[PDB]
Amino acid sequence: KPANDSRKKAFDERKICYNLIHQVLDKLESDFAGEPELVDGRPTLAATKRMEAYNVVNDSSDEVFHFDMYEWYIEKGWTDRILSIDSPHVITYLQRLAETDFRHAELLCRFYTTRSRFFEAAQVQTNLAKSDLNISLKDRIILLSRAKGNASVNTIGISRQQQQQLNHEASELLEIAHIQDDLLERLVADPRIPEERKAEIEEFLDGPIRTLTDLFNDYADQANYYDLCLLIFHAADFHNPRTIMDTWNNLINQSHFEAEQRREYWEIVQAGGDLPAGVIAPIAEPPLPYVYVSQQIQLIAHRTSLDSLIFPVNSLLPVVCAYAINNGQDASIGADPCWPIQLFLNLGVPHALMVQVLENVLDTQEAPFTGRRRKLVVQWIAMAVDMWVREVERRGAMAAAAASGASGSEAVMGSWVSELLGRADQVLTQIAGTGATLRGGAASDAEEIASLRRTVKGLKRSVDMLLGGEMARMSFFR
Amino acid sequence: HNIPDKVFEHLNAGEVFTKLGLFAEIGYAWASIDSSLFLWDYTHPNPELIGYEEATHTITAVALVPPKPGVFVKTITHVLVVATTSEIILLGVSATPTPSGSKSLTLYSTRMSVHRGGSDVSFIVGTKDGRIFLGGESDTDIHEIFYQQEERWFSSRCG
């Protein structure tokens, strides 16, 4: 349709006829709105006029007309009839108009899929998601999500390699898209963001998908959304342990302060006071800070799957343990002193790796894990090894039933675990001694420590029995 | 290029004042929310937000100007001027181009700052030679910020 050309006139004189045809069909369905297609069995007169009319339509060989009718069906929303044509003519017509409009591309893709041509649909959807057409972020998320699905299934005549490469590009773009969508939503809803800025954020984020650098620098880092920063380091395969840990430290501290604030507001309601202007009260005890913090760690863990570089257990577990000590998230407030260990075990950290780290914590005596607070470190080790023992015992029972002989990867216990418990007993003996000669009077934790000793000895016994042959005889009857 | 969603979260989290602006010379935009500032590369499809929240009072103006010659290391390409209701703050900027075609932005502290005074600052402009001029919505007066590398017993690094 080159402008300035003089066939336009010829096209316009046909468009006036085609429009009038629309009115006829429109008035037809209108006149016969509520009329049944069959009465007493055979067809009515209102039905026959519908067939006679639509006959004339499908009996035409005017091509500009049939194009105008495809466009018209699309307009009125009749996916009913258009997807049921059969003809390629309509496919070929769509193949030209696809890279141009979202609605048309969706029709094309629908045609492909019903013909088991999933890969071709995934290609159209992906390109559309990367394009500069006016498409919203959420629609780009839907397009990518569909492409991902369609590229993950076999399409005949296309190599596995070509499928996987597309499925992979869609998966990466979908991950980034979801991040961008989380940002945009949070920023717009953020009470501490000026309206003037929000409109600006909506303009640059509710469109084509942006790079991970931009999302980090211009948005996630500026607004201190550290959880999203971490997801971004994951999606970018960001190799930088120090920055990752700095972000973990900021996330923990930010969450702690927020939980503290919410518990304060609550305490004011239960005392009669008034909350700051524009502060929605809490009608129910909010969670203690260590509970909200660990909630944050879980949400991220499930989103990244522990196999990431944003979960270096050797650095992250000591930091969380550090937090617990330095912020009195312990028995004084009614929390389980082993909560940090429980958290990472349920999360699915392998028992061997846990004990391995805890050993390092105990040997190096760093940051807060010093003096008599190593009492706490010993308790964590006791709890970790205890769970490990229980695991080995159940895996033994497990393999006696469903019979066979195996055990790969999983670290297996060595004498080092036994030695570790020996040293742990020494540390306790040392802490108890130092506690008995403190200035001001003996320490109050005498029996508390005597108990821990018994537990540790019990565990060394068990571990010694397993190590000593009771582990190779677990699938045997006693 | 849509505004990142995280900026919308901060903007709608604004208590008193927000503002948007452009650094078109380097393909960056910025948003201020109260005493916090966020920059981002708008050419990037999923930008990361460069956050700067050292400021104590509401930001009223932000600008990117050339540096004064013979003051900073050659790798410093610009100076970021941040005006609040209490002071004006200078930050070193290095906007080095990347393989993708969008400048990589890193910020440097300077210890250069001056108390604002009684006159609002809503407009900041810079000359080719790095001179920084200020004006606002209190009066028609025009101020200039001076700065130098050396500290002196009779003169501060920034005036």
Binding site: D221, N250 | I50, V73, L107, Y108
Partner: peptide, 14 residues
Amino acid sequence: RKAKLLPMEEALLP
């Protein structure tokens, strides 16, 4: 993420 502010020592010469 709060932007890392590299020191004045690098910034200004000499």
